Design a protein around this ligand. Structure first.
Ligand code: A1BGH
Lengths: 156, 39
């Protein structure tokens, strides 16, 4: 099917009508998404099939057709862009200065932007257009607002 | 049975809408991939 680089919606017809369960990034022949979007299930691209290749529930990431390819990192200083792909709506870029998730195992960038659950997997980009992580695994803070980690995998 | 549909190119867009704050939070990540606030 379509193997062109870019951002894609992850759809399903199992529920009422056609429902968007998430989003992903096709790069260097590999499809990258968050684990909670597909639960590791196989995907269809037109008449072709994409099989999972690597996945990890704790990182909440999965790659199809090959190993994880995305290796850019947030520089810790600059604004970034969430290329949000909401259900039933056109892809749109939102610029923001990330906050920080402080963990016992190090610091991670975080974006304080709230979109429907089906937007999970939308890429976060640097000024060179490189994908520095995926949106959709986060927390609800004291205010009640939503903050997503900038989740990035490892390129072997 | 899930399927994928192209939604666009991945590019930085000049003069995009600028919003969102930058909170600094202490968080924990459990074995199930769920983040929680550490207080
Ligand atoms: C963006 N997102 C992802 C998910 C999750 F399903 F947990 F994966 N939930 C949200 C948002 C949806 C709107 C309300 N706040 C949370």
């Amino acid at each position: 099917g379509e193997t062109t680089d870019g951002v894609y919606r992850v759809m399903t017809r199992r529920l009422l009508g056609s429902t968007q369960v998430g989003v992903g990034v096709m790069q260097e022949g590999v499809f990258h998404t968050m684990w909670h979007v597909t639960k590791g299930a196989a995907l269809r691209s037109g008449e072709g099939r994409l099989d999972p290749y690597w996945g990890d529930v704790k990182q909440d990431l999965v790659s199809y057709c090959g190993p994880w390819k995305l290796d850019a990192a947030w520089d810790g200083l600059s604004e970034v862009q969430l290329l949000a792909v909401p259900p039933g709506e056109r892809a749109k870029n939102i610029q923001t200065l990330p906050g920080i998730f402080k963990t016992k195992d190090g610091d991670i960038g975080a974006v304080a932007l709230d979109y429907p659950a089906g937007t999970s997997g939308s890429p976060i980009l640097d000024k060179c257009g490189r994908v520095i992580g995926l949106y959709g695994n986060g927390v609800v803070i004291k205010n009640g607002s939503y903050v997503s980690a900038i989740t990035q995998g490892k390129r072997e | 049975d899930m399927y994928i549909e192209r939604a666009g190119d991945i590019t930085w867009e000049k003069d995009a809408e600028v919003t969102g704050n930058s909170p600094r939070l202490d968080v924990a990540l459990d074995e199930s991939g769920d983040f929680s606030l550490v207080e």
